[PDB]
PDB file of N, CA and C in Angstrom:
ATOM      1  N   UNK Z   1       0.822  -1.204   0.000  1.00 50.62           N
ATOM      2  CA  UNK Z   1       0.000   0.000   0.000  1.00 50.62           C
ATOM      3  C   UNK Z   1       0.857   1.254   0.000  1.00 50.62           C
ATOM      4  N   UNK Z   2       1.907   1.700   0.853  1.00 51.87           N
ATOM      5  CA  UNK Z   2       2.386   2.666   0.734  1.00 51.87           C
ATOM      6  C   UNK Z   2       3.627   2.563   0.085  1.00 51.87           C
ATOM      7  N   UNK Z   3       3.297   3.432  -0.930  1.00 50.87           N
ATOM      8  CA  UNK Z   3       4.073   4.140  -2.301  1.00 50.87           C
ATOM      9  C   UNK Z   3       4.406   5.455  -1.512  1.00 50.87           C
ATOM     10  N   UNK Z   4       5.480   5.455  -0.762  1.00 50.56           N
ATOM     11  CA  UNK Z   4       5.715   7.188  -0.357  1.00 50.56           C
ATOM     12  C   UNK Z   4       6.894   7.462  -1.195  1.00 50.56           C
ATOM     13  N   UNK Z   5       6.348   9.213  -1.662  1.00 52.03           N
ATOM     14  CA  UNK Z   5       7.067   9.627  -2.714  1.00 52.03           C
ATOM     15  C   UNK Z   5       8.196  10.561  -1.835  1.00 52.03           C
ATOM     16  N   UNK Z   6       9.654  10.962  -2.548  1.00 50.93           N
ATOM     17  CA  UNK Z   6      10.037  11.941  -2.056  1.00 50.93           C
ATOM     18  C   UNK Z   6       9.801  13.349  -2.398  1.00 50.93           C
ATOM     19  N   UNK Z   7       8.841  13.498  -2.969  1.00 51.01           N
ATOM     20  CA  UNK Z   7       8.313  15.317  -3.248  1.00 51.01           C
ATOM     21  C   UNK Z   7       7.572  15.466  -2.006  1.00 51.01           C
ATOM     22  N   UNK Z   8       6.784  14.081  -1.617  1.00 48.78           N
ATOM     23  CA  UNK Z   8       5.787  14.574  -0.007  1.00 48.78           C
ATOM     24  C   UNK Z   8       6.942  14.340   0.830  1.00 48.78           C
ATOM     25  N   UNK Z   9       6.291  15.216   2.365  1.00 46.72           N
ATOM     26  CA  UNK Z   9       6.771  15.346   3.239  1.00 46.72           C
ATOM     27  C   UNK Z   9       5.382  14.828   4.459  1.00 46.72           C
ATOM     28  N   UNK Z  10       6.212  13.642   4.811  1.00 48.74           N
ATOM     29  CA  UNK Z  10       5.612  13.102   5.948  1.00 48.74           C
ATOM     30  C   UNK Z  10       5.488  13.734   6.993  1.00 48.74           C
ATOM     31  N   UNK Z  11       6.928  14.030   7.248  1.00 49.90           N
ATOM     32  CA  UNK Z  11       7.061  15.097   8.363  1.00 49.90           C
ATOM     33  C   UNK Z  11       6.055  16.462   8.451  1.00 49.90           C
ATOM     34  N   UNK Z  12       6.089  17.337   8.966  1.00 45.87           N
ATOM     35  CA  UNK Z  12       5.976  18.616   9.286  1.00 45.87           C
ATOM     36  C   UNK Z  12       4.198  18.996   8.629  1.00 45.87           C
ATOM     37  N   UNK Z  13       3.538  18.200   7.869  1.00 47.64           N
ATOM     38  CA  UNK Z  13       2.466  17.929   7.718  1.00 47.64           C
ATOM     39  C   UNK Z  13       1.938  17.422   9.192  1.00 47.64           C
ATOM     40  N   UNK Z  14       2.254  16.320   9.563  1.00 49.56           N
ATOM     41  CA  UNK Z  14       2.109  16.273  11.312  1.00 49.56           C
ATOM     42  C   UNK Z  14       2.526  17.367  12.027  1.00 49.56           C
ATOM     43  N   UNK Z  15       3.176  18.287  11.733  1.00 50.73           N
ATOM     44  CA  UNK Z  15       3.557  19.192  12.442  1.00 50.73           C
ATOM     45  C   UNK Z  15       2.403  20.504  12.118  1.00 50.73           C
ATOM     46  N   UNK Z  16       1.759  20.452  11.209  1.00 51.08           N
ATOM     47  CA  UNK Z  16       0.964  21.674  10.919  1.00 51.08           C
ATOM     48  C   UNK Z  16      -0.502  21.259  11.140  1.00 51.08           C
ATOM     49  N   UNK Z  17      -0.473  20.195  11.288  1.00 48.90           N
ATOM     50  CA  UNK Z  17      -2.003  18.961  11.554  1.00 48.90           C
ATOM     51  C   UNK Z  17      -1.949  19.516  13.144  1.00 48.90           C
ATOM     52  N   UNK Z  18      -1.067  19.254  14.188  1.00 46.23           N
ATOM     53  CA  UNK Z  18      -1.130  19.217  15.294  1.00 46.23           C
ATOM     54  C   UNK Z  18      -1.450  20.339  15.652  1.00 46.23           C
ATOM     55  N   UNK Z  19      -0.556  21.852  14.781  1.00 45.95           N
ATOM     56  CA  UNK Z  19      -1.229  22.941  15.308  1.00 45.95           C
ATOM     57  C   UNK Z  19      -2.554  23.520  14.971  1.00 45.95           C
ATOM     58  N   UNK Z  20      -3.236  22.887  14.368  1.00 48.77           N
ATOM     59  CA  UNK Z  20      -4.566  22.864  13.587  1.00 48.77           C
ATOM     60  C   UNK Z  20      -5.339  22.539  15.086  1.00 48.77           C
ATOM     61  N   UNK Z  21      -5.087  21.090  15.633  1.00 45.46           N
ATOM     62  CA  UNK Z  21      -6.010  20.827  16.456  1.00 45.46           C
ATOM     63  C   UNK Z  21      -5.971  21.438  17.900  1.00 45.46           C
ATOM     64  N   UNK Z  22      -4.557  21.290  18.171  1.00 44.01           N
ATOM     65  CA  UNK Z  22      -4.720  21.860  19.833  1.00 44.01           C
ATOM     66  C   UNK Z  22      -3.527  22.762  19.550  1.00 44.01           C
ATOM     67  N   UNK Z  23      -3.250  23.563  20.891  1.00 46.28           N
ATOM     68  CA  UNK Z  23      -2.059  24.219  21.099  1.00 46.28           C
ATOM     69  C   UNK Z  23      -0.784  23.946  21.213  1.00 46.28           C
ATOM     70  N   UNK Z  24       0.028  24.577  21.216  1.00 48.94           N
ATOM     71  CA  UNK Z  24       1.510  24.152  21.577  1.00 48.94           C
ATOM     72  C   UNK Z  24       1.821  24.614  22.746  1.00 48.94           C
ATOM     73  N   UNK Z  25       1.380  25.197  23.439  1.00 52.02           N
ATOM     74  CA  UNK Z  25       1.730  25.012  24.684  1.00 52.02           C
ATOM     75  C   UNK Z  25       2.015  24.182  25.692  1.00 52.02           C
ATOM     76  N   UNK Z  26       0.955  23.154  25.393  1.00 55.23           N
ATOM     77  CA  UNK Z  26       1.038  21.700  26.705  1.00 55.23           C
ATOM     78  C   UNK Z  26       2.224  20.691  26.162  1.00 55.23           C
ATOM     79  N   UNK Z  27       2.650  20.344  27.528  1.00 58.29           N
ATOM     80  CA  UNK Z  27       3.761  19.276  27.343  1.00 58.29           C
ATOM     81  C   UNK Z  27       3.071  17.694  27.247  1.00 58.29           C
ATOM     82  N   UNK Z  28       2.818  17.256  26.397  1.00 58.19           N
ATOM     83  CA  UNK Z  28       2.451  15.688  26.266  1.00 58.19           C
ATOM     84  C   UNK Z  28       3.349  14.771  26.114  1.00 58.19           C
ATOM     85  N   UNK Z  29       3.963  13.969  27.462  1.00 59.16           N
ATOM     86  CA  UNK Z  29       5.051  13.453  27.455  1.00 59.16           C
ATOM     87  C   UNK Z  29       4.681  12.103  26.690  1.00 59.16           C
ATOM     88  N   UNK Z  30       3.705  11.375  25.997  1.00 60.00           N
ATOM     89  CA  UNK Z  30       3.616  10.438  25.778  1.00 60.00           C
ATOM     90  C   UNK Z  30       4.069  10.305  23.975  1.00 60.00           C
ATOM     91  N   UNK Z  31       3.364  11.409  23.336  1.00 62.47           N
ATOM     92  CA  UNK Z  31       4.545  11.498  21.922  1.00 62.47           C
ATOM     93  C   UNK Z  31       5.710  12.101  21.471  1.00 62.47           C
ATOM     94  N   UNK Z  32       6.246  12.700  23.455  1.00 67.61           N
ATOM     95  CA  UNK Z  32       7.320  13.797  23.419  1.00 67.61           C
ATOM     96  C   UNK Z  32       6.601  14.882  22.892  1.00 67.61           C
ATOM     97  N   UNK Z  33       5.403  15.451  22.537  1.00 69.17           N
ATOM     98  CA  UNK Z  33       4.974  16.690  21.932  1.00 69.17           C
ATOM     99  C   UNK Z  33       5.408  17.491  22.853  1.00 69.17           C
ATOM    100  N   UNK Z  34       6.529  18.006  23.051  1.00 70.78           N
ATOM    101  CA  UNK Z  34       7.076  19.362  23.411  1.00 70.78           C
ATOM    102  C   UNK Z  34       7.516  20.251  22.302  1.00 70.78           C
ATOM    103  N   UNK Z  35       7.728  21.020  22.661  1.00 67.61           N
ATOM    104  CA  UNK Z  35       7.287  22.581  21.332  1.00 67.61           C
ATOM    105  C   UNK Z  35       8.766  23.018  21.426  1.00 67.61           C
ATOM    106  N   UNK Z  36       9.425  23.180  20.544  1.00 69.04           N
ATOM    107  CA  UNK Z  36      10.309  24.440  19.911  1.00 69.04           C
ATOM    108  C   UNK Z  36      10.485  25.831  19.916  1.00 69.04           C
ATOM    109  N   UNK Z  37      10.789  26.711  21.319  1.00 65.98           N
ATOM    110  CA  UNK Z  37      10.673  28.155  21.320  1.00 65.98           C
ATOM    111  C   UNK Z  37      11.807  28.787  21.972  1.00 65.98           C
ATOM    112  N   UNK Z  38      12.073  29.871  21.249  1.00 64.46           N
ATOM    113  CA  UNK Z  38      13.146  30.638  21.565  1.00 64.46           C
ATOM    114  C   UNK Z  38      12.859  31.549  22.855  1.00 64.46           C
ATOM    115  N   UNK Z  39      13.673  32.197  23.548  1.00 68.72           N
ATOM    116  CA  UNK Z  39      13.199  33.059  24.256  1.00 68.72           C
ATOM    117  C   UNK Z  39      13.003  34.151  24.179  1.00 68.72           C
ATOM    118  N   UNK Z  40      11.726  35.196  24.356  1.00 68.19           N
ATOM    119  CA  UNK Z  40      11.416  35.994  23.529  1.00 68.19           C
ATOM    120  C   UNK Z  40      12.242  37.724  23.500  1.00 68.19           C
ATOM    121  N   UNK Z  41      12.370  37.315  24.908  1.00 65.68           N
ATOM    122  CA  UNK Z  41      13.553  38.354  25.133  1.00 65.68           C
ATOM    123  C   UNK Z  41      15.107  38.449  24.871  1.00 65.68           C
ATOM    124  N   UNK Z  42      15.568  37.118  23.967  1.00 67.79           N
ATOM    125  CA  UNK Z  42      17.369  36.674  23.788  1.00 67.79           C
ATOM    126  C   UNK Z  42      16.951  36.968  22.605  1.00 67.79           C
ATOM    127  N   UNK Z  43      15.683  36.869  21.579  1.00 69.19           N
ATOM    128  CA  UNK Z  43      16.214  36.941  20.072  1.00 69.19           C
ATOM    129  C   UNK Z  43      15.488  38.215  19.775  1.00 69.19           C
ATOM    130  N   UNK Z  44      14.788  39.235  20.340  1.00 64.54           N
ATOM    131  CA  UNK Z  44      14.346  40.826  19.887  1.00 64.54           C
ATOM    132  C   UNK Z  44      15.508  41.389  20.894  1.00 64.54           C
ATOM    133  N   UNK Z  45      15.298  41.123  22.304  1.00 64.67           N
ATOM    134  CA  UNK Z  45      16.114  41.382  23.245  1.00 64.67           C
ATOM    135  C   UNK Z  45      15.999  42.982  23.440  1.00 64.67           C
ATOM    136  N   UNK Z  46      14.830  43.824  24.099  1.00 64.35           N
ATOM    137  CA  UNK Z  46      14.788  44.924  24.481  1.00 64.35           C
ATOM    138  C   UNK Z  46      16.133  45.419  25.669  1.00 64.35           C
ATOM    139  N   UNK Z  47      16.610  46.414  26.172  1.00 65.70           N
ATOM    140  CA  UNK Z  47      17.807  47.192  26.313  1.00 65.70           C
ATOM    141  C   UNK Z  47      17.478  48.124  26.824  1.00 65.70           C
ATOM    142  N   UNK Z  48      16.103  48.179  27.940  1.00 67.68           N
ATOM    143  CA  UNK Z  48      15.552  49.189  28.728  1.00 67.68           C
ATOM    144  C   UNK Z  48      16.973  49.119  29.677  1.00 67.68           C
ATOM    145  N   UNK Z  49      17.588  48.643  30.172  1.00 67.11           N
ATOM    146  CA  UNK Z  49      18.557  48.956  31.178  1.00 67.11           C
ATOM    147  C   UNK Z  49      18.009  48.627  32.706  1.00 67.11           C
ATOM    148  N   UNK Z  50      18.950  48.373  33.743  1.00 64.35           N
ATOM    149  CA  UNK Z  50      18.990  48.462  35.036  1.00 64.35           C
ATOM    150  C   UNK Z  50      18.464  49.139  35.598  1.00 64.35           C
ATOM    151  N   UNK Z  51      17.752  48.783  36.644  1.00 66.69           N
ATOM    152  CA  UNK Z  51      16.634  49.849  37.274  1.00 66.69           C
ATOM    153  C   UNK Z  51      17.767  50.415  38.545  1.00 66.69           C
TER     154      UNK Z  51
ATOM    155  N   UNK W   1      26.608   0.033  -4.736  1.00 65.90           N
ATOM    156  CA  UNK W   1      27.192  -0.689  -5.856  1.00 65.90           C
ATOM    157  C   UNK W   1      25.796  -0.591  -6.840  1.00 65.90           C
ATOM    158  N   UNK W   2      26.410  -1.074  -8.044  1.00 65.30           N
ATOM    159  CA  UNK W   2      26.285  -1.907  -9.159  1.00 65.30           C
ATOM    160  C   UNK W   2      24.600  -2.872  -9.048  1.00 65.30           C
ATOM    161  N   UNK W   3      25.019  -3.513  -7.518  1.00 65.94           N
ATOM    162  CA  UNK W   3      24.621  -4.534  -6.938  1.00 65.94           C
ATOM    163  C   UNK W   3      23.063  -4.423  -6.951  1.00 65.94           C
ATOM    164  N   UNK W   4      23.023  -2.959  -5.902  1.00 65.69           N
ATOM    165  CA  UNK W   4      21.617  -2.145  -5.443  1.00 65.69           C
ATOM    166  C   UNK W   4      21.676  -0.984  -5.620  1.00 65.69           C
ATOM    167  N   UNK W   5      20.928  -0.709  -6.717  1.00 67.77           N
ATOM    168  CA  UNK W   5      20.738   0.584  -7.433  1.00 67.77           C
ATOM    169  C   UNK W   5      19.690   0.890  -7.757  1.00 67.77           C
ATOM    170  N   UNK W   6      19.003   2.306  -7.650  1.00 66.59           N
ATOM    171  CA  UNK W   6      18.031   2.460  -8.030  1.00 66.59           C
ATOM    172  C   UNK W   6      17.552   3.809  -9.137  1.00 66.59           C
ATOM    173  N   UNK W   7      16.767   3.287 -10.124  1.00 64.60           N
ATOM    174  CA  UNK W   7      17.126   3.906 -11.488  1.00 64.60           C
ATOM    175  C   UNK W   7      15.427   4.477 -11.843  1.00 64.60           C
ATOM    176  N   UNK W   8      15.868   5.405 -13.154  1.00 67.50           N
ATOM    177  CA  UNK W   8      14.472   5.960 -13.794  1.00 67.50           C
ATOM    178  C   UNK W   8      14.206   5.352 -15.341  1.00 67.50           C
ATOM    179  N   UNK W   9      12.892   5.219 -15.095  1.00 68.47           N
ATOM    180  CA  UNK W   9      13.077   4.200 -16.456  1.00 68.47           C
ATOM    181  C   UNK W   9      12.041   5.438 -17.656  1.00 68.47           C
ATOM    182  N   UNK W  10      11.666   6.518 -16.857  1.00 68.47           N
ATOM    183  CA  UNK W  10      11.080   7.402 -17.462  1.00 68.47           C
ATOM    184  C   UNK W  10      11.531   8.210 -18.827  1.00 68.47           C
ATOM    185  N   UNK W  11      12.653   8.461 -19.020  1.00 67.22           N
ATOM    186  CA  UNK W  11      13.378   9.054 -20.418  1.00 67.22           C
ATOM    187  C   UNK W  11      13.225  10.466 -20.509  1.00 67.22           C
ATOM    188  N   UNK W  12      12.592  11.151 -19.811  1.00 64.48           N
ATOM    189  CA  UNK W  12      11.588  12.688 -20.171  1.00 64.48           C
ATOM    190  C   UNK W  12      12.761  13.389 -19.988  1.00 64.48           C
ATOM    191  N   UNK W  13      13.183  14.020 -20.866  1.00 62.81           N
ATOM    192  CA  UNK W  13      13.780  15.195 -21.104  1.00 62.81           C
ATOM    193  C   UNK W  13      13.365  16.449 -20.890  1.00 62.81           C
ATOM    194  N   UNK W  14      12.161  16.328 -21.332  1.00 65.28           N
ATOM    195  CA  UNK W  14      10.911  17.808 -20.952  1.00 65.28           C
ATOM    196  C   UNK W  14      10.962  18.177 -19.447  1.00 65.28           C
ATOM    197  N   UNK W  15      10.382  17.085 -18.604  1.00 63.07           N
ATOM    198  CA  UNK W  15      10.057  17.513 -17.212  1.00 63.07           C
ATOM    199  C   UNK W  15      11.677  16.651 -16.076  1.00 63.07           C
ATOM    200  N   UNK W  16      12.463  17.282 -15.837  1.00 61.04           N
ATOM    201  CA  UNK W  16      13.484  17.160 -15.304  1.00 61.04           C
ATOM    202  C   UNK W  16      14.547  17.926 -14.497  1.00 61.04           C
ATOM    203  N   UNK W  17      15.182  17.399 -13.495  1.00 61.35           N
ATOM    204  CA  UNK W  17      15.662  15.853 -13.283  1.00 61.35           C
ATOM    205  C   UNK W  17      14.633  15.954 -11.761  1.00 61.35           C
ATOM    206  N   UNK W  18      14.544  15.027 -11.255  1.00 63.63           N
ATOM    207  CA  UNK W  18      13.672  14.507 -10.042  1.00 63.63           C
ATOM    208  C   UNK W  18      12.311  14.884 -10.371  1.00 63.63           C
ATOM    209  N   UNK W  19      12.071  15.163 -11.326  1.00 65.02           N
ATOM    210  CA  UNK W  19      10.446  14.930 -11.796  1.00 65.02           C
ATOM    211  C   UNK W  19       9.887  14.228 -12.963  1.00 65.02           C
ATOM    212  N   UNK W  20      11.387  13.917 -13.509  1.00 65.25           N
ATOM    213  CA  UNK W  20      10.655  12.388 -14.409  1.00 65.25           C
ATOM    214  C   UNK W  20      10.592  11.035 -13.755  1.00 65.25           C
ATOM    215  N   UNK W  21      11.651  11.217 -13.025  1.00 63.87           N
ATOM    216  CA  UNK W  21      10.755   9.936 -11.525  1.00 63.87           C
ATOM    217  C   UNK W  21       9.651  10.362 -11.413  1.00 63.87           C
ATOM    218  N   UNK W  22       9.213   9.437 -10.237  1.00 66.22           N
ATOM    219  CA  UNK W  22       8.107   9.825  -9.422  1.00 66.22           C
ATOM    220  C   UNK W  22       6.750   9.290 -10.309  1.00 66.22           C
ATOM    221  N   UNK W  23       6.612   9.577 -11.465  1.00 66.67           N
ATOM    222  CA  UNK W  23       5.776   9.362 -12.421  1.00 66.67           C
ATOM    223  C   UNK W  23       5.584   8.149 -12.981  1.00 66.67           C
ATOM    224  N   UNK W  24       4.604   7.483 -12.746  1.00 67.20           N
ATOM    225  CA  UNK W  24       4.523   5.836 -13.545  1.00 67.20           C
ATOM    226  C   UNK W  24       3.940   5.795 -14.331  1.00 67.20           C
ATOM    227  N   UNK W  25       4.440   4.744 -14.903  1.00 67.34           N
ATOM    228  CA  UNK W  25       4.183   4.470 -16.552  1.00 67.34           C
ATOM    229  C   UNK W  25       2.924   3.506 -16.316  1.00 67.34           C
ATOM    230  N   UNK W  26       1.897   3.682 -16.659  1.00 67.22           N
ATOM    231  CA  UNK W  26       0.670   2.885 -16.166  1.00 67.22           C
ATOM    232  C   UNK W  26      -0.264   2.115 -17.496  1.00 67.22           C
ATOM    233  N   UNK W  27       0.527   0.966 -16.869  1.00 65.29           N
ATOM    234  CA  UNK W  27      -0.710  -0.313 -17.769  1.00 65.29           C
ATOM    235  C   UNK W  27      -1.825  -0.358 -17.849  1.00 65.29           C
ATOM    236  N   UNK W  28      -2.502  -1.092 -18.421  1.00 63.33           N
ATOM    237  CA  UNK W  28      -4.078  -1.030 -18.377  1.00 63.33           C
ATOM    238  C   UNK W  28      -4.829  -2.074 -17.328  1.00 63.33           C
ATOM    239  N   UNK W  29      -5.294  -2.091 -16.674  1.00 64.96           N
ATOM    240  CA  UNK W  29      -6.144  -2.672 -15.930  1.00 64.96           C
ATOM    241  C   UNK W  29      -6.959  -3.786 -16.728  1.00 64.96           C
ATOM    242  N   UNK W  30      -7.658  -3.524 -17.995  1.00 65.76           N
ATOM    243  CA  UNK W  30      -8.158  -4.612 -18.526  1.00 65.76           C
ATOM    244  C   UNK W  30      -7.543  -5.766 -18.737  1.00 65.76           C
ATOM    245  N   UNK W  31      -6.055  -5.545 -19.306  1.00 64.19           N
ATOM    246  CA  UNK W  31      -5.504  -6.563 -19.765  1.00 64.19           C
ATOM    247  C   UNK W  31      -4.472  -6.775 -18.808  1.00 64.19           C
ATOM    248  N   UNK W  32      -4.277  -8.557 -18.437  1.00 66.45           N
ATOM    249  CA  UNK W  32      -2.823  -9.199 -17.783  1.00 66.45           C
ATOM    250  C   UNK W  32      -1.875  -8.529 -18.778  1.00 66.45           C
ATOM    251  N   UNK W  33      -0.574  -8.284 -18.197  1.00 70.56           N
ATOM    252  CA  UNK W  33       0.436  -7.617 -19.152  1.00 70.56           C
ATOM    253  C   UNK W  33       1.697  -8.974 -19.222  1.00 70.56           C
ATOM    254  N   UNK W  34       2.725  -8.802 -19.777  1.00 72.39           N
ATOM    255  CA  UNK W  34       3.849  -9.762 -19.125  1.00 72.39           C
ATOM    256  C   UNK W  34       5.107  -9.157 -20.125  1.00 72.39           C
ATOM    257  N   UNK W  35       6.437  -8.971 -19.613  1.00 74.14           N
ATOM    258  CA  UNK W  35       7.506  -8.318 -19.967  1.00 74.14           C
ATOM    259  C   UNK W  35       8.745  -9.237 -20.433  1.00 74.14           C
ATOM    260  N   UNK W  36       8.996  -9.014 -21.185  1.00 74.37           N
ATOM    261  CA  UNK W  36      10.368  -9.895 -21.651  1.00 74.37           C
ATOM    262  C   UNK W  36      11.887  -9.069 -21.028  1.00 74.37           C
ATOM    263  N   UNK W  37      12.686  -9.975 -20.124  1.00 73.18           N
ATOM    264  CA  UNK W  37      13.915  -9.293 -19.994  1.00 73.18           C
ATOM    265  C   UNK W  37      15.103 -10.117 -20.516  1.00 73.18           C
ATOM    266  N   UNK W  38      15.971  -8.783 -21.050  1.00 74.41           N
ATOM    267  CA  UNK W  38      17.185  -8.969 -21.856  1.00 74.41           C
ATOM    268  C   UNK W  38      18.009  -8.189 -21.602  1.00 74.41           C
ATOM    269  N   UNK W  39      19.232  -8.617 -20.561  1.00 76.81           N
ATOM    270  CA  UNK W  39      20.226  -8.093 -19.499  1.00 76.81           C
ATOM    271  C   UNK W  39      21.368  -8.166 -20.659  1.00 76.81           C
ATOM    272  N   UNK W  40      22.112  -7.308 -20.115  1.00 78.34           N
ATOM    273  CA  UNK W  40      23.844  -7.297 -20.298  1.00 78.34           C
ATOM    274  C   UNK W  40      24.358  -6.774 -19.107  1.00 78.34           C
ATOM    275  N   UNK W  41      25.689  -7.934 -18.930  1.00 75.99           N
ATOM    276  CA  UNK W  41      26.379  -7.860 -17.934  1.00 75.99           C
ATOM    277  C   UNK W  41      27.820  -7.624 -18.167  1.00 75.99           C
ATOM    278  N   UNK W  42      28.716  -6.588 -17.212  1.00 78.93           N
ATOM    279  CA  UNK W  42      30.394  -6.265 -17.194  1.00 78.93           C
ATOM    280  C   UNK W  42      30.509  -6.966 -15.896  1.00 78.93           C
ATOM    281  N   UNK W  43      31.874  -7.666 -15.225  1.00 81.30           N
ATOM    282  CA  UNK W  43      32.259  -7.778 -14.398  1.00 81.30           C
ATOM    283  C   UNK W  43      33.414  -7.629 -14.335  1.00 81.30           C
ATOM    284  N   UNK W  44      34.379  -7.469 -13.002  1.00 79.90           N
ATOM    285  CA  UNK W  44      35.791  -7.631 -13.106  1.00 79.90           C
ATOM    286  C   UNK W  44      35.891  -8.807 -12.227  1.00 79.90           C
ATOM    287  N   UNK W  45      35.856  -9.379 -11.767  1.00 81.81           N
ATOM    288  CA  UNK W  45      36.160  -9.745 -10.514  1.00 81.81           C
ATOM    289  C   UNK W  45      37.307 -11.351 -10.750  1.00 81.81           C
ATOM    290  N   UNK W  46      38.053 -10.582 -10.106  1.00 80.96           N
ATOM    291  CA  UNK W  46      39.147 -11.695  -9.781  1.00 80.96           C
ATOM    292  C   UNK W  46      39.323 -13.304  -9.305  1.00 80.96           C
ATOM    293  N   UNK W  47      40.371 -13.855  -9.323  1.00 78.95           N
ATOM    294  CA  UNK W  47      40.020 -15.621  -8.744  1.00 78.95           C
ATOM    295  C   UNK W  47      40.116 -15.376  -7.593  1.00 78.95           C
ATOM    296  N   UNK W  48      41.227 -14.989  -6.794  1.00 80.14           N
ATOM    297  CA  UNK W  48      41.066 -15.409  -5.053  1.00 80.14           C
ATOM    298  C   UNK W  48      40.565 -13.732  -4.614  1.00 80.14           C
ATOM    299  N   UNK W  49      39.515 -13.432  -3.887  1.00 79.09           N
ATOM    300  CA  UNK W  49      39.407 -12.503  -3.151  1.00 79.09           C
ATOM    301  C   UNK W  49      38.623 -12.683  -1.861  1.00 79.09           C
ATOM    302  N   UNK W  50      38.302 -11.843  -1.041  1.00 78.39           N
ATOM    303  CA  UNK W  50      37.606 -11.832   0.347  1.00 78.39           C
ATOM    304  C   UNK W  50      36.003 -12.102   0.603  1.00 78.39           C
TER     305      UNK W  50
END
């Protein structure tokens, strides 16, 4: 039955399916669904200074 | 190798390269089909090796 081609992408189709249904926020340790995020202040990184 | 290789039997000059793969050459459903094969073979291979 499965004829998988290399023009599809198996991958990241699950990855855009998942954010379709629920959030990325929750940690679901059972398919490892933990999320990918930078921190939001190391990569804009505001420079208000020391209080 | 030689051995396990995997090839395009497509020819298309028009739509290419990694998109004349992918594309099958499709028989007819009505009729059983059956193919005649006619190989040629090179080898080197020596008398004593590993």
């Amino acid at each position: 039955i499965v004829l998988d081609l290399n023009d599809r992408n198996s991958e990241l189709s699950y990855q855009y399916l998942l954010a379709d249904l629920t959030s990325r926020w929750h940690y679901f340790a059972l398919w490892n669904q933990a999320v990918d995020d930078y921190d939001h202040h190391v990569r804009i990184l505001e420079n208000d200074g020391y209080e | 190798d030689h051995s396990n290789f995997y090839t395009n039997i497509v020819q298309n000059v028009d739509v290419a390269p990694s998109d004349a793969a992918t594309q099958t050459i499709k028989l007819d459903e009505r009729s059983r089909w059956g193919g005649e094969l006619h190989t040629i073979l090179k080898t080197n291979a020596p008398n004593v090796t590993e």
